[PDB]
Protein backbone atom coordinates (compact mmCIF):
# COMPACT_ATOMS: atom_id res chain seq x y z
CA UNK A 1 0.00 0.00 0.00
CA UNK A 2 1.37 3.37 -1.04
CA UNK A 3 -0.88 5.13 1.46
CA UNK A 4 0.73 3.32 4.40
CA UNK A 5 4.28 3.88 3.12
CA UNK A 6 3.97 7.61 2.48
CA UNK A 7 2.21 8.02 5.83
CA UNK A 8 5.22 6.44 7.57
CA UNK A 9 7.72 8.42 5.49
CA UNK A 10 6.08 11.70 6.54
CA UNK A 11 6.49 10.59 10.14
CA UNK A 12 10.18 9.96 9.50
CA UNK A 13 10.99 13.26 7.80
CA UNK A 14 8.70 15.25 10.10
CA UNK A 15 10.35 13.67 13.14
CA UNK A 16 13.81 14.45 11.80
CA UNK A 17 12.95 18.07 11.04
CA UNK A 18 11.27 18.86 14.35
CA UNK A 19 13.92 16.96 16.34
CA UNK A 20 16.81 18.90 14.77
CA UNK A 21 15.71 22.54 14.56
CA UNK A 22 18.66 24.90 14.15
CA UNK A 23 17.71 28.55 14.71
CA UNK A 24 19.69 31.28 13.03
CA UNK A 25 21.84 33.24 15.46
CA UNK A 26 19.62 36.28 14.96
CA UNK A 27 18.32 38.71 17.56
CA UNK A 28 17.26 42.33 17.44
CA UNK A 29 16.56 43.81 20.87
CA UNK A 30 15.25 43.10 24.37
CA UNK A 31 13.63 39.80 23.42
CA UNK A 32 17.00 38.40 22.36
CA UNK A 33 17.94 38.41 26.06
CA UNK A 34 15.09 36.05 26.90
CA UNK A 35 16.16 33.93 23.94
CA UNK A 36 19.62 33.78 25.51
CA UNK A 37 17.93 32.68 28.72
CA UNK A 38 16.24 29.85 26.87
CA UNK A 39 19.70 28.61 25.82
CA UNK A 40 20.93 29.00 29.40
CA UNK A 41 21.17 26.03 31.78
CA UNK A 42 17.69 26.22 33.33
CA UNK A 43 15.86 25.58 30.05
CA UNK A 44 18.74 24.36 27.87
CA UNK A 45 17.09 24.45 24.46
CA UNK A 46 19.97 22.31 23.19
CA UNK A 47 18.51 19.38 25.13
CA UNK A 48 15.62 19.44 22.63
CA UNK A 49 18.02 19.34 19.69
CA UNK A 50 17.65 23.10 19.17
CA UNK A 51 21.10 24.42 18.26
CA UNK A 52 21.97 27.98 17.27
CA UNK A 53 24.00 28.34 14.10
CA UNK A 54 25.12 31.64 12.65
CA UNK A 55 24.96 30.93 8.93
CA UNK A 56 21.53 31.18 7.25
CA UNK A 57 22.62 28.36 4.95
CA UNK A 58 22.73 26.08 8.01
CA UNK A 59 19.56 27.33 9.72
CA UNK A 60 15.99 26.03 9.78
CA UNK A 61 14.24 28.63 11.95
CA UNK A 62 14.40 32.40 12.13
CA UNK A 63 13.36 33.64 15.56
CA UNK A 64 12.55 37.32 15.04
CA UNK A 65 13.44 38.40 18.58
CA UNK A 66 12.88 42.12 18.83
CA UNK A 67 11.88 45.30 17.04
CA UNK A 68 12.15 45.32 13.27
CA UNK A 69 12.92 48.79 11.95
CA UNK A 70 12.54 49.96 8.37
CA UNK A 71 16.33 50.18 8.12
CA UNK A 72 16.73 46.54 9.20
CA UNK A 73 13.80 45.17 7.18
CA UNK A 74 15.70 44.50 3.91
CA UNK A 75 18.48 42.78 5.86
CA UNK A 76 16.01 40.49 7.65
CA UNK A 77 14.38 39.60 4.34
CA UNK A 78 17.80 38.94 2.82
CA UNK A 79 18.82 36.44 5.49
CA UNK A 80 15.40 34.77 5.46
CA UNK A 81 15.57 34.35 1.69
CA UNK A 82 19.04 32.84 2.04
CA UNK A 83 17.71 30.07 4.30
CA UNK A 84 17.34 26.72 2.50
CA UNK A 85 14.01 25.08 2.72
CA UNK A 86 12.08 23.92 4.60
CA UNK A 87 12.33 27.04 6.75
CA UNK A 88 10.15 28.42 9.53
CA UNK A 89 9.76 31.79 11.23
CA UNK A 90 8.90 32.36 14.88
CA UNK A 91 7.79 35.90 15.72
CA UNK A 92 8.83 36.68 19.29
CA UNK A 93 7.33 39.48 21.35
CA UNK A 94 5.02 42.41 20.76
CA UNK A 95 7.47 44.34 18.59
CA UNK A 96 7.90 41.54 16.08
CA UNK A 97 4.27 40.45 16.41
CA UNK A 98 2.62 43.73 15.48
CA UNK A 99 4.91 46.63 16.33
CA UNK A 100 4.22 46.65 20.06
CA UNK A 101 5.02 49.86 21.88
CA UNK A 102 6.69 51.48 18.87
CA UNK A 103 3.72 50.59 16.68
CA UNK A 104 3.01 54.20 15.69
CA UNK A 105 6.67 55.02 15.08
CA UNK A 106 7.80 56.34 11.69
CA UNK A 107 10.83 54.01 11.69
CA UNK A 108 9.24 50.72 12.81
CA UNK A 109 7.72 47.92 10.75
CA UNK A 110 4.28 47.16 12.21
CA UNK A 111 4.78 43.43 12.53
CA UNK A 112 7.40 41.22 10.91
CA UNK A 113 4.66 39.36 9.01
CA UNK A 114 4.68 42.29 6.59
CA UNK A 115 8.16 41.11 5.56
CA UNK A 116 8.24 37.32 6.09
CA UNK A 117 5.64 34.58 6.59
CA UNK A 118 5.31 33.65 10.26
CA UNK A 119 4.55 30.18 11.63
CA UNK A 120 4.21 30.89 15.38
CA UNK A 121 3.48 34.14 17.23
CA UNK A 122 4.82 34.23 20.80
CA UNK A 123 3.12 36.97 22.88
CA UNK A 124 4.81 39.00 25.59
CA UNK A 125 7.05 42.02 26.11
CA UNK A 126 9.27 40.11 26.44
CA UNK A 127 7.85 36.61 26.51
CA UNK A 128 9.45 34.71 29.33
CA UNK A 129 12.11 32.26 28.24
CA UNK A 130 9.59 29.54 29.07
CA UNK A 131 6.95 31.24 26.91
CA UNK A 132 9.40 31.12 24.00
CA UNK A 133 10.20 27.48 24.75
CA UNK A 134 6.46 26.83 24.62
CA UNK A 135 6.42 28.53 21.21
CA UNK A 136 9.24 26.34 19.92
CA UNK A 137 7.45 23.20 21.09
CA UNK A 138 4.31 24.47 19.37
CA UNK A 139 6.33 24.77 16.16
CA UNK A 140 7.55 21.20 16.62
CA UNK A 141 3.97 19.95 16.85
CA UNK A 142 3.08 21.97 13.75
CA UNK A 143 5.92 20.28 11.85
CA UNK A 144 4.67 16.96 13.23
CA UNK A 145 1.34 17.65 11.47
CA UNK A 146 2.87 18.23 8.03
CA UNK A 147 1.50 15.99 5.28
CA UNK A 148 3.93 16.67 2.44
CA UNK A 149 4.25 13.10 1.13
CA UNK A 150 0.58 12.25 1.69
CA UNK A 151 -0.36 15.28 -0.39
CA UNK A 152 2.23 14.41 -3.01
CA UNK A 153 0.82 10.88 -3.20
CA UNK A 154 -2.73 12.09 -3.89
CA UNK A 155 -1.74 14.71 -6.47
CA UNK B 1 -18.09 27.27 -18.64
CA UNK B 2 -19.87 29.55 -21.11
CA UNK B 3 -23.18 27.66 -20.93
CA UNK B 4 -22.94 27.02 -17.19
CA UNK B 5 -22.09 30.65 -16.34
CA UNK B 6 -23.10 32.82 -19.32
CA UNK B 7 -21.89 36.05 -17.67
CA UNK B 8 -18.43 34.59 -17.11
CA UNK B 9 -15.46 36.58 -18.34
CA UNK B 10 -13.22 34.10 -20.15
CA UNK B 11 -9.57 35.07 -20.62
CA UNK B 12 -7.34 33.38 -23.21
CA UNK B 13 -3.65 34.20 -22.66
CA UNK B 14 -0.69 33.19 -24.75
CA UNK B 15 2.32 31.70 -22.96
CA UNK B 16 2.97 33.77 -19.84
CA UNK B 17 6.56 34.72 -19.08
CA UNK B 18 7.70 35.71 -15.62
CA UNK B 19 9.98 34.71 -12.79
CA UNK B 20 8.16 31.45 -11.99
CA UNK B 21 7.06 30.69 -15.55
CA UNK B 22 7.48 27.36 -17.29
CA UNK B 23 8.23 29.18 -20.56
CA UNK B 24 11.42 31.25 -20.53
CA UNK B 25 12.73 29.14 -17.66
CA UNK B 26 11.80 26.03 -19.65
CA UNK B 27 13.94 27.11 -22.61
CA UNK B 28 16.86 28.21 -20.44
CA UNK B 29 16.94 24.88 -18.59
CA UNK B 30 17.45 22.98 -21.86
CA UNK B 31 21.12 23.93 -21.51
CA UNK B 32 21.54 20.96 -19.16
CA UNK B 33 21.27 18.70 -22.22
CA UNK B 34 23.80 20.59 -24.35
CA UNK B 35 22.08 21.59 -27.57
CA UNK B 36 18.52 22.82 -27.99
CA UNK B 37 16.25 20.49 -30.03
CA UNK B 38 13.54 22.24 -32.03
CA UNK B 39 11.00 20.75 -34.42
CA UNK B 40 12.04 21.92 -37.89
CA UNK B 41 14.59 24.15 -36.13
CA UNK B 42 11.69 26.17 -34.76
CA UNK B 43 11.36 28.04 -38.05
CA UNK B 44 7.71 26.99 -38.53
CA UNK B 45 6.33 28.33 -35.24
CA UNK B 46 5.35 31.83 -34.13
CA UNK B 47 4.78 32.77 -30.48
CA UNK B 48 3.30 35.92 -28.94
CA UNK B 49 4.22 35.55 -25.27
CA UNK B 50 2.60 37.83 -22.70
CA UNK B 51 3.92 39.21 -19.42
CA UNK B 52 2.59 37.88 -16.12
CA UNK B 53 1.94 41.33 -14.65
CA UNK B 54 0.02 42.32 -17.79
CA UNK B 55 -2.21 39.26 -17.39
CA UNK B 56 -2.67 39.97 -13.68
CA UNK B 57 -3.67 43.58 -14.30
CA UNK B 58 -6.07 42.40 -17.00
CA UNK B 59 -7.74 40.04 -14.54
CA UNK B 60 -7.96 42.74 -11.86
CA UNK B 61 -9.37 45.28 -14.32
CA UNK B 62 -11.91 42.73 -15.53
CA UNK B 63 -13.29 42.38 -12.00
CA UNK B 64 -13.96 46.11 -11.72
CA UNK B 65 -15.06 46.74 -15.31
CA UNK B 66 -18.79 46.07 -15.85
CA UNK B 67 -18.19 45.63 -19.59
CA UNK B 68 -16.14 42.49 -18.98
CA UNK B 69 -19.19 40.34 -18.16
CA UNK B 70 -19.96 37.64 -20.71
CA UNK B 71 -16.94 38.69 -22.78
CA UNK B 72 -13.96 36.70 -24.01
CA UNK B 73 -10.54 38.34 -24.08
CA UNK B 74 -7.26 37.32 -25.71
CA UNK B 75 -4.24 38.41 -23.67
CA UNK B 76 -1.24 38.56 -26.00
CA UNK B 77 2.08 40.34 -25.92
CA UNK B 78 3.01 43.24 -28.17
CA UNK B 79 5.32 41.35 -30.57
CA UNK B 80 5.33 38.07 -32.47
CA UNK B 81 8.52 36.01 -32.83
CA UNK B 82 9.67 32.91 -34.62
CA UNK B 83 10.34 30.20 -32.07
CA UNK B 84 13.96 29.95 -33.20
CA UNK B 85 14.60 33.65 -32.62
CA UNK B 86 12.81 33.57 -29.27
CA UNK B 87 14.84 30.62 -28.00
CA UNK B 88 17.99 32.18 -29.44
CA UNK B 89 17.14 35.39 -27.58
CA UNK B 90 16.68 33.45 -24.33
CA UNK B 91 20.19 32.02 -24.61
CA UNK B 92 21.63 35.41 -25.55
CA UNK B 93 20.18 37.01 -22.41
CA UNK B 94 21.37 34.08 -20.28
CA UNK B 95 24.80 34.15 -21.99
CA UNK B 96 24.66 30.42 -22.59
CA UNK B 97 26.04 28.76 -25.74
CA UNK B 98 23.23 28.16 -28.23
CA UNK B 99 23.53 25.01 -30.37
CA UNK B 100 20.17 24.37 -32.04
CA UNK B 101 19.62 21.29 -34.16
CA UNK B 102 16.55 19.87 -35.92
CA UNK B 103 14.73 16.96 -34.33
CA UNK B 104 11.71 15.34 -36.04
CA UNK B 105 8.33 15.33 -34.35
CA UNK B 106 8.22 11.55 -33.98
CA UNK B 107 11.69 11.46 -32.42
CA UNK B 108 10.98 14.46 -30.21
CA UNK B 109 7.54 13.15 -29.29
CA UNK B 110 9.50 10.06 -28.21
CA UNK B 111 11.69 12.11 -25.87
CA UNK B 112 8.59 13.59 -24.25
CA UNK B 113 7.23 10.19 -23.24
CA UNK B 114 10.66 9.27 -21.86
CA UNK B 115 10.50 12.19 -19.43
CA UNK B 116 6.86 11.39 -18.62
CA UNK B 117 8.04 8.43 -16.51
CA UNK B 118 8.90 10.82 -13.67
CA UNK B 119 6.53 10.22 -10.72
CA UNK B 120 7.10 13.86 -9.74
CA UNK B 121 6.81 17.01 -11.85
CA UNK B 122 7.94 16.04 -15.38
CA UNK B 123 10.68 18.17 -16.88
CA UNK B 124 8.85 17.89 -20.21
CA UNK B 125 5.99 15.91 -21.71
CA UNK B 126 4.72 15.14 -25.18
CA UNK B 127 1.86 17.58 -24.61
CA UNK B 128 4.31 20.34 -23.71
CA UNK B 129 6.34 19.62 -26.84
CA UNK B 130 3.21 20.10 -28.97
CA UNK B 131 2.14 23.28 -27.17
CA UNK B 132 5.57 24.88 -27.46
CA UNK B 133 5.52 24.29 -31.22
CA UNK B 134 1.92 25.42 -31.73
CA UNK B 135 1.74 28.76 -33.52
CA UNK B 136 -0.08 31.34 -31.43
CA UNK B 137 -3.45 32.13 -32.98
CA UNK B 138 -4.49 35.57 -34.22
CA UNK B 139 -8.01 36.42 -33.03
CA UNK B 140 -8.79 40.00 -34.08
CA UNK B 141 -12.50 39.64 -33.30
CA UNK B 142 -11.75 39.23 -29.58
CA UNK B 143 -10.87 42.13 -27.28
CA UNK B 144 -7.38 42.25 -25.83
CA UNK B 145 -5.39 43.84 -23.02
CA UNK B 146 -5.86 47.33 -24.48
CA UNK B 147 -9.63 46.94 -24.02
CA UNK B 148 -8.97 46.65 -20.27
CA UNK B 149 -6.63 49.64 -20.04
CA UNK B 150 -3.38 47.66 -19.94
CA UNK B 151 -0.28 48.28 -22.06
CA UNK B 152 1.27 44.95 -23.01
CA UNK B 153 4.84 44.90 -21.73
CA UNK B 154 7.47 43.92 -24.33
CA UNK B 155 9.48 40.77 -23.72
CA UNK B 156 12.73 42.68 -24.16
CA UNK B 157 12.04 44.85 -21.09
CA UNK B 158 11.54 41.93 -18.67
CA UNK B 159 13.52 38.93 -19.93
CA UNK B 160 16.57 39.87 -17.85
CA UNK B 161 14.29 39.95 -14.81
CA UNK B 162 13.58 36.27 -15.45
CA UNK B 163 16.84 35.04 -16.96
CA UNK B 164 19.56 36.69 -14.87
CA UNK B 165 19.69 33.73 -12.48
CA UNK B 166 20.47 31.35 -15.36
CA UNK B 167 23.78 33.12 -16.04
CA UNK B 168 27.11 32.01 -14.63
CA UNK B 169 29.07 34.29 -12.31
CA UNK B 170 31.09 35.62 -15.26
CA UNK B 171 27.97 37.14 -16.83
CA UNK B 172 25.71 37.92 -13.86
CA UNK B 173 26.28 41.68 -13.95
CA UNK B 174 25.61 42.15 -17.69
CA UNK B 175 23.10 44.95 -18.20
CA UNK B 176 19.83 45.05 -20.11
CA UNK B 177 21.47 46.74 -23.11
CA UNK B 178 24.03 44.04 -24.01
CA UNK B 179 21.75 41.74 -26.05
CA UNK B 180 20.15 42.80 -29.32
CA UNK B 181 16.37 42.28 -29.50
CA UNK B 182 15.15 39.28 -31.45
CA UNK B 183 13.59 39.71 -34.87
CA UNK B 184 9.85 40.34 -34.70
CA UNK B 185 7.12 39.84 -37.30
CA UNK B 186 5.08 42.84 -38.52
Amino acid sequence: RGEYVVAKLDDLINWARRSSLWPMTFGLACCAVEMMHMAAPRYDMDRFGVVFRASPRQSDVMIVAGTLTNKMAPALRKVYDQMPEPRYVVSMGSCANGGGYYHYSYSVVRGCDRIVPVDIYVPGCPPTAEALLYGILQLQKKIKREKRLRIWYRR
Amino acid sequence: VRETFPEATIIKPAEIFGREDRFLNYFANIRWFGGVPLISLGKKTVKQPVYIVDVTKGIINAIKDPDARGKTFAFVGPSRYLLFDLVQYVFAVAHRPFLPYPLPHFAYRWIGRLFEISPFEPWTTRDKVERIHTTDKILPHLPGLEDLGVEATPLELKAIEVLRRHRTYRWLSSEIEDVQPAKTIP
Binding site: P41, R42, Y43, D44, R47, S94, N97, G98, G99, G100, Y101, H103, Y104, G111, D113, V118, D119, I120, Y121, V122, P123, G124, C125, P127, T128, A129, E130, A131, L133, Y134, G135, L137, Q138, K142 | -
Partner: protein, 176 residues
Protein backbone atom coordinates in the same frame (compact mmCIF):
# COMPACT_ATOMS: atom_id res chain seq x y z
CA UNK C 1 37.96 55.20 48.07
CA UNK C 2 39.42 53.38 45.08
CA UNK C 3 41.54 50.29 44.48
CA UNK C 4 43.95 49.18 41.77
CA UNK C 5 42.88 46.16 39.75
CA UNK C 6 46.20 45.56 37.95
CA UNK C 7 49.24 47.31 39.45
CA UNK C 8 51.63 44.56 40.57
CA UNK C 9 55.41 44.25 40.61
CA UNK C 10 56.38 40.56 40.33
CA UNK C 11 59.07 39.02 42.50
CA UNK C 12 62.50 38.52 40.94
CA UNK C 13 63.98 36.01 43.37
CA UNK C 14 65.08 32.71 41.86
CA UNK C 15 62.17 30.75 43.33
CA UNK C 16 59.59 33.15 41.91
CA UNK C 17 61.35 33.28 38.53
CA UNK C 18 61.44 29.47 38.37
CA UNK C 19 57.80 29.19 39.46
CA UNK C 20 56.93 31.34 36.46
CA UNK C 21 59.25 29.30 34.23
CA UNK C 22 57.46 26.10 35.24
CA UNK C 23 54.11 27.80 34.69
CA UNK C 24 55.08 28.88 31.16
CA UNK C 25 56.55 25.53 30.12
CA UNK C 26 54.23 23.18 32.04
CA UNK C 27 51.02 25.15 31.42
CA UNK C 28 50.10 25.03 35.11
CA UNK C 29 47.56 27.85 34.92
CA UNK C 30 45.97 26.19 31.88
CA UNK C 31 45.63 22.90 33.77
CA UNK C 32 44.04 24.77 36.67
CA UNK C 33 41.38 25.96 34.23
CA UNK C 34 40.67 22.41 33.10
CA UNK C 35 40.05 21.43 36.70
CA UNK C 36 37.27 23.98 37.01
CA UNK C 37 35.29 22.69 34.01
CA UNK C 38 35.95 19.15 35.23
CA UNK C 39 34.40 20.11 38.56
CA UNK C 40 31.26 21.28 36.73
CA UNK C 41 30.99 18.02 34.79
CA UNK C 42 30.34 16.27 38.11
CA UNK C 43 27.84 18.83 39.41
CA UNK C 44 24.12 18.33 39.05
CA UNK C 45 22.90 20.53 36.17
CA UNK C 46 20.35 23.30 36.60
CA UNK C 47 18.05 22.14 33.79
CA UNK C 48 14.39 21.59 34.59
CA UNK C 49 12.21 19.17 32.64
CA UNK C 50 9.88 21.53 30.81
CA UNK C 51 6.87 21.19 30.23
CA UNK C 52 6.65 18.63 33.02
CA UNK C 53 8.47 21.01 35.38
CA UNK C 54 7.92 24.76 35.37
CA UNK C 55 9.95 27.80 36.32
CA UNK C 56 8.82 29.38 39.58
CA UNK C 57 6.56 32.42 39.41
CA UNK C 58 4.99 34.70 42.00
CA UNK C 59 1.44 36.02 42.50
CA UNK C 60 2.42 39.33 40.88
CA UNK C 61 3.19 37.74 37.50
CA UNK C 62 1.91 39.70 34.51
CA UNK C 63 0.54 37.31 31.88
CA UNK C 64 -2.52 36.96 29.69
CA UNK C 65 -5.35 39.45 30.25
CA UNK C 66 -8.81 38.60 31.55
CA UNK C 67 -12.03 40.43 32.41
CA UNK C 68 -13.47 39.49 35.79
CA UNK C 69 -16.92 39.30 37.36
CA UNK C 70 -18.44 39.82 40.78
CA UNK C 71 -19.52 36.69 42.66
CA UNK C 72 -23.06 37.19 41.31
CA UNK C 73 -21.74 36.90 37.74
CA UNK C 74 -22.12 40.58 36.90
CA UNK C 75 -19.18 42.09 35.02
CA UNK C 76 -16.88 44.19 37.15
CA UNK C 77 -16.07 46.51 34.25
CA UNK C 78 -18.07 49.74 34.23
CA UNK C 79 -16.62 51.25 31.04
CA UNK C 80 -14.80 53.99 32.94
CA UNK C 81 -11.99 53.88 30.32
CA UNK C 82 -9.19 54.49 32.84
CA UNK C 83 -7.33 51.44 31.54
CA UNK C 84 -7.69 52.76 28.01
CA UNK C 85 -6.40 56.18 29.05
CA UNK C 86 -3.31 54.89 30.87
CA UNK C 87 -2.34 52.12 28.42
CA UNK C 88 1.17 53.15 27.33
CA UNK C 89 0.76 51.30 24.03
CA UNK C 90 -2.81 52.42 23.20
CA UNK C 91 -3.61 48.70 23.05
CA UNK C 92 -7.12 48.97 24.56
CA UNK C 93 -10.18 50.09 22.60
CA UNK C 94 -13.52 50.58 24.36
CA UNK C 95 -17.06 51.52 23.41
CA UNK C 96 -19.93 51.64 25.87
CA UNK C 97 -23.61 52.47 26.25
CA UNK C 98 -26.49 51.86 28.67
CA UNK C 99 -27.32 48.17 28.75
CA UNK C 100 -30.92 47.02 28.29
CA UNK C 101 -31.30 47.67 32.00
CA UNK C 102 -29.76 50.90 33.24
CA UNK C 103 -26.27 49.53 33.71
CA UNK C 104 -23.12 51.26 32.45
CA UNK C 105 -21.36 48.54 30.46
CA UNK C 106 -19.04 48.10 27.50
CA UNK C 107 -20.12 47.06 24.03
CA UNK C 108 -16.54 46.90 22.76
CA UNK C 109 -13.50 45.94 24.81
CA UNK C 110 -10.48 45.01 22.68
CA UNK C 111 -6.87 44.39 23.58
CA UNK C 112 -4.37 44.21 20.74
CA UNK C 113 -2.03 41.71 22.37
CA UNK C 114 0.58 42.57 19.72
CA UNK C 115 0.52 46.22 20.82
CA UNK C 116 0.44 45.40 24.53
CA UNK C 117 3.66 45.62 26.54
CA UNK C 118 2.26 43.57 29.44
CA UNK C 119 3.12 46.43 31.77
CA UNK C 120 0.13 46.01 34.08
CA UNK C 121 -0.81 49.70 34.21
CA UNK C 122 -4.35 48.77 33.16
CA UNK C 123 -4.94 46.60 36.22
CA UNK C 124 -3.38 49.28 38.43
CA UNK C 125 -5.69 51.88 36.89
CA UNK C 126 -8.85 49.79 37.13
CA UNK C 127 -10.95 50.89 40.14
CA UNK C 128 -12.98 47.66 40.36
CA UNK C 129 -10.42 44.93 39.58
CA UNK C 130 -12.17 44.20 36.29
CA UNK C 131 -9.16 43.96 33.96
CA UNK C 132 -6.26 41.89 35.27
CA UNK C 133 -3.16 40.27 33.84
CA UNK C 134 -3.47 36.61 34.71
CA UNK C 135 -0.84 33.95 35.35
CA UNK C 136 -1.05 32.35 31.90
CA UNK C 137 2.00 32.71 29.66
CA UNK C 138 1.42 29.75 27.30
CA UNK C 139 -0.88 31.21 24.65
CA UNK C 140 1.26 31.48 21.54
CA UNK C 141 -0.78 31.23 18.35
CA UNK C 142 -0.31 30.27 14.72
CA UNK C 143 -1.83 33.49 13.34
CA UNK C 144 -1.57 37.18 14.13
CA UNK C 145 -5.34 37.66 14.19
CA UNK C 146 -5.64 35.26 17.13
CA UNK C 147 -3.86 37.85 19.30
CA UNK C 148 -6.44 40.62 18.74
CA UNK C 149 -8.71 39.89 21.69
CA UNK C 150 -12.28 41.17 21.70
CA UNK C 151 -14.59 41.33 24.70
CA UNK C 152 -15.81 37.74 24.25
CA UNK C 153 -12.28 36.33 24.36
CA UNK C 154 -11.40 38.34 27.47
CA UNK C 155 -14.56 37.38 29.35
CA UNK C 156 -13.83 33.75 28.49
CA UNK C 157 -10.31 34.19 29.87
CA UNK C 158 -11.76 35.45 33.14
CA UNK C 159 -14.21 32.56 33.34
CA UNK C 160 -11.38 30.18 32.45
CA UNK C 161 -8.81 31.52 34.93
CA UNK C 162 -10.85 33.07 37.76
CA UNK C 163 -10.04 30.30 40.24
CA UNK C 164 -6.31 31.00 39.97
CA UNK C 165 -6.72 34.76 39.46
CA UNK C 166 -8.80 35.29 42.60
CA UNK C 167 -6.26 33.38 44.69
CA UNK C 168 -3.39 35.45 43.26
CA UNK C 169 -5.19 38.72 44.00
CA UNK C 170 -5.86 37.39 47.50
CA UNK C 171 -2.13 36.90 48.05
CA UNK C 172 -1.07 40.33 46.76
CA UNK C 173 -3.87 42.87 47.31
CA UNK C 174 -2.49 43.96 50.70
CA UNK C 175 0.67 45.10 48.90
CA UNK C 176 -1.50 47.24 46.61
Amino acid sequence: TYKYVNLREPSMDMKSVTDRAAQTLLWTELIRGLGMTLSYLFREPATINYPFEKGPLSPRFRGEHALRRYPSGEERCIACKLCEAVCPAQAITIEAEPRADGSRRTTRYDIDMTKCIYCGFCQEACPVDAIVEGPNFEFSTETHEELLYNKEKLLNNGDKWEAEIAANIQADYLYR
